Amino acid sequence: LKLASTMEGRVEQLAEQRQVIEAGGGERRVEKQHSQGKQTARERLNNLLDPHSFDEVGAFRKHRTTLFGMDKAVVPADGVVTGRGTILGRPVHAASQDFTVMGGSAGETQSTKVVETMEQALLTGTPFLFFYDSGGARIQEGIDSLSGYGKMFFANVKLSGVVPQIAIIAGPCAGGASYSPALTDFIIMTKKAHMFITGPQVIKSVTGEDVTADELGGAEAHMAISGNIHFVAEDDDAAELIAKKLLSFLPQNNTEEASFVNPNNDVSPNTELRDIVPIDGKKGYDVRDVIAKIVDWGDYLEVKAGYATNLVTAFARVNGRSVGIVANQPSVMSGCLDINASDKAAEFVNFCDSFNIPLVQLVDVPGFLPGVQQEYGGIIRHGAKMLYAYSEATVPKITVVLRKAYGGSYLAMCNRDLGADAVYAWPSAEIAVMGAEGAANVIFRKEIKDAMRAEKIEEYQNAFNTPYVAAARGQVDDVIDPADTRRKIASALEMYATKRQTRPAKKHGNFPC
Amino acid sequence: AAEFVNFCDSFNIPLVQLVDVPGFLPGVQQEYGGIIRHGAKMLYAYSEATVPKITVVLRKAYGGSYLAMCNRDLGADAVYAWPSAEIAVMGAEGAANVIFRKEIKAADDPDAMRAEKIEEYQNAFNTPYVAAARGQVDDVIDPADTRRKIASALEMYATKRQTRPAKKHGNFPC
Amino acid sequence: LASTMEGRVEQLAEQRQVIEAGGGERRVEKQHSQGKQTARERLNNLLDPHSFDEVGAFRKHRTTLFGMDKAVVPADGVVTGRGTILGRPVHAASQDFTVMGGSAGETQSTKVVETMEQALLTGTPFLFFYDSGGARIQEGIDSLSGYGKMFFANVKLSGVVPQIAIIAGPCAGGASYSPALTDFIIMTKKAHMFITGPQVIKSVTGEDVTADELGGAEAHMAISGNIHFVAEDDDAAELIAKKLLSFLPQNNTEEASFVNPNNDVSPNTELRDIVPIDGKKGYDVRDVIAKIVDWGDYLEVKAGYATNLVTAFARVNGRSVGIVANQPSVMSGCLDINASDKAAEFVNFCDSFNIPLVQLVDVPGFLPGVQQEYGGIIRHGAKMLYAYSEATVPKITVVLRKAYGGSYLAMCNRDLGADAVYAWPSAEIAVMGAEGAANVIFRKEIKAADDPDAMRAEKIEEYQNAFNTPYVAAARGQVDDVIDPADTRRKIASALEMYATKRQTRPAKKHGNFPC
Numbered sequence A: 001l002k003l004a005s006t007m008e009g010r011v012e013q014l015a016e017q018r019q020v021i022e023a024g025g026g027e028r029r030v031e032k033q034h035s036q037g038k039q040t041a042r043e044r045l046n047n048l049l050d051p052h053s054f055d056e057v058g059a060f061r062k063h064r065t066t067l068f069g070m071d072k073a074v075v076p077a078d079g080v081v082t083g084r085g086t087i088l089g090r091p092v093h094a095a096s097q098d099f100t101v102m103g104g105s106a107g108e109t110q111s112t113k114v115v116e117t118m119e120q121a122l123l124t125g126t127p128f129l130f131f132y133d134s135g136g137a138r139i140q141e142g143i144d145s146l147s148g149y150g151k152m153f154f155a156n157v158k159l160s161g162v163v164p165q166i167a168i169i170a171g172p173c174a175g176g177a178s179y180s181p182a183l184t185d186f187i188i189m190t191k192k193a194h195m196f197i198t199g200p201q202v203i204k205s206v207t208g209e210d211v212t213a214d215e216l217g218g219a220e221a222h223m224a225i226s227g228n229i230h231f232v233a234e235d236d237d238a239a240e241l242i243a244k245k246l247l248s249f250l251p252q253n254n255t256e257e258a259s260f261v262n263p264n265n266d267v268s269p270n271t272e273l274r275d276i277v278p279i280d281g282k283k284g285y286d287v288r289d290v291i292a293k294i295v296d297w298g299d300y301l302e303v304k305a306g307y308a309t310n311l312v313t314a315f316a317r318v319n320g321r322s323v324g325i326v327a328n329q330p331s332v333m334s335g336c337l338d339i340n341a342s343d344k345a346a347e348f349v350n351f352c353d354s355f356n357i358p359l360v361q362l363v364d365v366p367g368f369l370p371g372v373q374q375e376y377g378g379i380i381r382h383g384a385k386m387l388y389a390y391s392e393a394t395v396p397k398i399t400v401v402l403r404k405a406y407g408g409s410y411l412a413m414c415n416r417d418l419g420a421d422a423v424y425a426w427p428s429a430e431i432a433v434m435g436a437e438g439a440a441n442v443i444f445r446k447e448i449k450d451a452m453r454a455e456k457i458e459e460y461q462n463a464f465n466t467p468y469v470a471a472a473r474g475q476v477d478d479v480i481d482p483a484d485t486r487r488k489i490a491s492a493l494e495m496y497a498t499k500r501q502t503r504p505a506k507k508h509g510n511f512p513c
Numbered sequence B: 001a002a003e004f005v006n007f008c009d010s011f012n013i014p015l016v017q018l019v020d021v022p023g024f025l026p027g028v029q030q031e032y033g034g035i036i037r038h039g040a041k042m043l044y045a046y047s048e049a050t051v052p053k054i055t056v057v058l059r060k061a062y063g064g065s066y067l068a069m070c071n072r073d074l075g076a077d078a079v080y081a082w083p084s085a086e087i088a089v090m091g092a093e094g095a096a097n098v099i100f101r102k103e104i105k106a107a108d109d110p111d112a113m114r115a116e117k118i119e120e121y122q123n124a125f126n127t128p129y130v131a132a133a134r135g136q137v138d139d140v141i142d143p144a145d146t147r148r149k150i151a152s153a154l155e156m157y158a159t160k161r162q163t164r165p166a167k168k169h170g171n172f173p174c
Numbered sequence C: 001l002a003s004t005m006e007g008r009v010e011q012l013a014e015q016r017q018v019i020e021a022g023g024g025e026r027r028v029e030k031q032h033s034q035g036k037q038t039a040r041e042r043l044n045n046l047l048d049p050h051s052f053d054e055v056g057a058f059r060k061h062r063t064t065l066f067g068m069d070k071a072v073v074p075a076d077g078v079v080t081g082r083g084t085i086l087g088r089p090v091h092a093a094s095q096d097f098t099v100m101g102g103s104a105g106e107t108q109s110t111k112v113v114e115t116m117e118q119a120l121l122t123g124t125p126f127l128f129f130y131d132s133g134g135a136r137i138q139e140g141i142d143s144l145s146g147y148g149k150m151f152f153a154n155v156k157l158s159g160v161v162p163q164i165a166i167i168a169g170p171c172a173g174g175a176s177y178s179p180a181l182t183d184f185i186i187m188t189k190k191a192h193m194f195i196t197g198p199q200v201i202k203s204v205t206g207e208d209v210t211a212d213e214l215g216g217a218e219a220h221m222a223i224s225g226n227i228h229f230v231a232e233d234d235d236a237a238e239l240i241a242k243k244l245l246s247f248l249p250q251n252n253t254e255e256a257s258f259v260n261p262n263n264d265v266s267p268n269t270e271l272r273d274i275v276p277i278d279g280k281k282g283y284d285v286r287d288v289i290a291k292i293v294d295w296g297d298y299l300e301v302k303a304g305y306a307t308n309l310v311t312a313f314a315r316v317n318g319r320s321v322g323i324v325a326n327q328p329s330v331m332s333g334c335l336d337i338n339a340s341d342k343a344a345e346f347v348n349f350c351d352s353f354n355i356p357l358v359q360l361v362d363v364p365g366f367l368p369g370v371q372q373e374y375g376g377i378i379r380h381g382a383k384m385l386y387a388y389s390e391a392t393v394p395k396i397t398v399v400l401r402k403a404y405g406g407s408y409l410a411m412c413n414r415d416l417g418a419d420a421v422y423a424w425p426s427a428e429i430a431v432m433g434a435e436g437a438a439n440v441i442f443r444k445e446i447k448a449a450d451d452p453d454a455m456r457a458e459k460i461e462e463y464q465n466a467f468n469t470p471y472v473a474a475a476r477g478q479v480d481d482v483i484d485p486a487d488t489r490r491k492i493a494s495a496l497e498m499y500a501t502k503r504q505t506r507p508a509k510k511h512g513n514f515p516c
């Protein structure tokens, strides 16, 4: 456009123009977005960031593509709103795709704005949050749009383990675009959002299978089946609340430990812990009741709550300090570890280590889930991920053995040989290489040739599988009264808050795939 | 400028630029005095600097003199344009006479063609909106908000950590 | 696209040939008629035969305004890639003047920067042939931004990998700052460089000057102090570029590979007769240099600028060394503003690339003159003291004759870190001339003498013998030994050998504050 004649007029022209840009795709498209139960790109940033803290970069930034109508197309902010702000006074950088603008298709300039914003986040050591709502790379831009995605993925990896990256899918996310969220640390999906590498149209044409976007890549599908996301949100409002709650446990970057939040310094006994875990190995329970009674105010944000529920991973705090809790869930699949739970735990453990969050595990595992599909699905390589993650982790590692701790599944839950700094055994702790029955059936195979098994099983069980034997060997530091758990963990965390562990020089180890 | 920039960089003092420069000073003695190697000191100092660099373009910002005042390409962390900002490779008139020379000389009304092309060039490149369109500025601002924009930029970049290639030192122009 | 792979391969060859043709036969003929090689002939002549591996021959501008949407601009006007020079990997760029006057398109500048980033990433030298009318006007702020990225890149590479600029045509405007940011500029006699052209100058100041007068190679060398070598033509510039490169390492983590070592360090008694005992008589310090460096070979830098001071690359036993020597045959060997810049730049460069510095001293002080003071000799002279004080490579100094006050310190004595300092028997290290000294401390004593003339001479002689002989300098430890001039080569060679394992560090800092 042509500039006005005076400075007052130009300031007015500027306000007018900015108003246009901010209207995105227009009132109708905006009403449509709203009718679908979705907030706009700007509304989401306004609700997420502290009031008036949004400092936008690139409102007037425009695409430079000219092919297939782009030369005449008006595309506000090239479809993405980027900038910095604060969440609870903490500086952050964020991006938000505007679906009302060419379906939020990722223009080349749009991805460039996102990468620049990510670089600023890295440069200043601040978290990065991105609201996705897009039809994928902008088709009219061909390889220019494709290149933008390549730059984005490289950036997600560059920031990985340096500054927290949170993705929020609040609408479509069609195609490889989805690899960006996968490369961030946490994905939050609303119930209006969708995500997939290959869409229903292509899948039907190619495989003959006709499914809906919701069955294929809706939030529930990704959470329970795919194992791709960490939180499901009812709508944008709840996703924003989740994003904030999540961020409160995380430091600004990898050079700091998260700031303590509303500490409960009380660590007196709580006999209620003695009853949650049945002395009868045949009876289960919800391990989260144990957690609730150990963490400050019983508060915890469970990660991947609806995935591989046989294992629980959740952020919580002890004396105001962020910690990551990894716990076997006996009330589900007997608390067995399996392919999916190995992945769920490993990712969590790795993330906590990258950001200096101590790890607390509550152990009650009978072993890995038996089954042909588990072997066929690579339980060997997926299970190795837990052993690797814990063995590589240098943050404080505190382990409490609640009940069963059998063979490899017990090592996977981080015992002292895997670098646990403190290990405690409850009086119902049953640490063994294998159940006494199957063990007896092996080492006494001959001498039993009947009912002779009874004495042998018993004898084996008493020689090794008792809390006192584990303690006798030094595998646990002490056998404790379950009511003192919170206090022992708290004291351990306090002492190891200054832990400085050395690791051999390497670009990186070989993390199992 | 260069000495001040190097000093501030050495002692972690952010650098704020206010730009209104039409170019370097024309003159035989400026050339004979080595404006090439002296002017290069500004480009050198800013490009090497790692402290926060914030630039506000008030009006004229032409060619190499604009780059010498630290634009995004020399590492400015935040750049703002007033509505009077005129970031340009060169003045619309000077440009026109070079690239439209032929079309002007052959036009039925040369003067009208020249004014037409100059207008075209000016609006196509030299307005705050095109600079913002290309991403050369973070935003076009109401001059009245200058202090706030500079203050927030300084605050967000207070944690800037920028590294440089390993070297004993670069070859600063003499 | 042809139907068969073979057909597509032939199509590729034809398409590539069109790009290599650049601006077409007429423009190529015009280039040649002006006595200039083309962009591709330049790379072909510089690089080892057939070693050029080109990147982006088919790269195209993305700009569309003012005719660009339809313009066919081959390689966007710059040929870029990697090759080798005497087997050493290098990266290079060559501007094509036959394509839109070699104007710097946004994509052209991007190609250049990418090439520079590759040289940094792989740690190899970067050479660039400039031949351009400046930023491509049709692209406005897009081409302007390209220059911003290029300048920032030149600085990023500064002191990491050697950067050599060859101006072989026009270099109009700010484009000129890239060459300024590289380490060495070689300019041919067909080139012209300037920030503001003759026309704009006249229209603004009324001054009348030709392009050749304002920015031809001779003006830049002798007046402006902007360039390092003047070349007759492209062939000579190419030879100079290779000769220059032969003294440099690939990057700052290495010392330059030795070349054709002459391990003989026999004396040479003729060295005793080059420097006159009569201090009022001069000589060409290069005669001394020729007698002490391998095969008498040396490549003088800025040979035609501030000739009162000589800076040159040479070798001792095969090792590259940078020599800094006062030239008593010009301005009595006085240091001045211009010589201070010339010396400091050379010292700073050698230090960044692990090249030892050898000083040959015969200086009576800085040039007296109101304009030297008004021109800032204080801040310019300080550059020499700063460059040598900061340098950590071996520093070897031989005091040939005069070594007066601050100018002596500027030539690197032990106090500024010289690792070995030798004095010839003619060495005259002094805080100031005995005559001026006496005249200050013995004024009244000379006054009240009824024959101050014989008194002056006495006090002057007394001062001279008390401080200004090489034996007193040696008595104080300011020099390691007083030596026979004939042994200069062996003494320098021996010192270089012992300090070849010198490991010296500086206080932690982003950088010091180099004088402007």
Ligand SMILES: C[C@@H](C(=O)O)C(=O)SCCNC(=O)CCNC(=O)[C@H](O)C(C)(C)COP(=O)(O)OP(=O)(O)OC[C@H]1O[C@@H](n2cnc3c(N)ncnc32)[C@H](O)[C@@H]1OP(=O)(O)O
Pocket (backbone or CB within 6 Å): A102, A103, A104, A105, A106, A134, A135, A136, A137, A138, A139, A140, A146, A172, A173, A174, A175, A176, A177, A197, A199
């Ligand atoms: C690399 C890569 C890959 O994944 O590997 C790529 O990204 S290939 C990527 C290919 N991308 C895609 O195949 C996905 C295609 N489009 C969709 O599935 C859908 O649009 C959807 C699920 C996002 C939305 O459906 P919807 O019905 O809500 O809506 P609409 O049809 O109205 O569309 C929103 C408007 O945005 C446009 N639109 C949507 N996606 C794109 C895109 N990728 N490029 C260009 N324009 C796009 C539509 O043409 C439409 O235009 P108007 O108002 O004018 O009608």
Ligand SMILES: C[C@@H](C(=O)O)C(=O)SCCNC(=O)CCNC(=O)[C@H](O)C(C)(C)COP(=O)(O)OP(=O)(O)OC[C@H]1O[C@@H](n2cnc3c(N)ncnc32)[C@H](O)[C@@H]1OP(=O)(O)O
Pocket (backbone or CB within 6 Å): B062, B063, B064, B065, B089, B090, B098, B099, C100, C101, C102, C103, C104, C132, C133, C134, C135, C136, C137, C138, C144, C147, C170, C172, C173, C174, C175, C195, C197
């Ligand atoms: C940032 C900045 C700055 O300095 O600060 C910019 O770079 S402003 C930069 C402004 N740059 C310039 O004003 C200088 C340009 N013009 C010249 O002084 C001269 O062209 C010259 C010394 C390079 C060439 O002299 P010459 O007679 O050999 O030749 P010619 O006139 O034929 O030119 C070569 C052809 O290249 C074109 N040409 C030359 N320079 C440019 C340029 N910067 N942008 C676009 N086209 C250009 C000419 O218009 C001409 O076009 P055709 O065949 O169509 O006639």
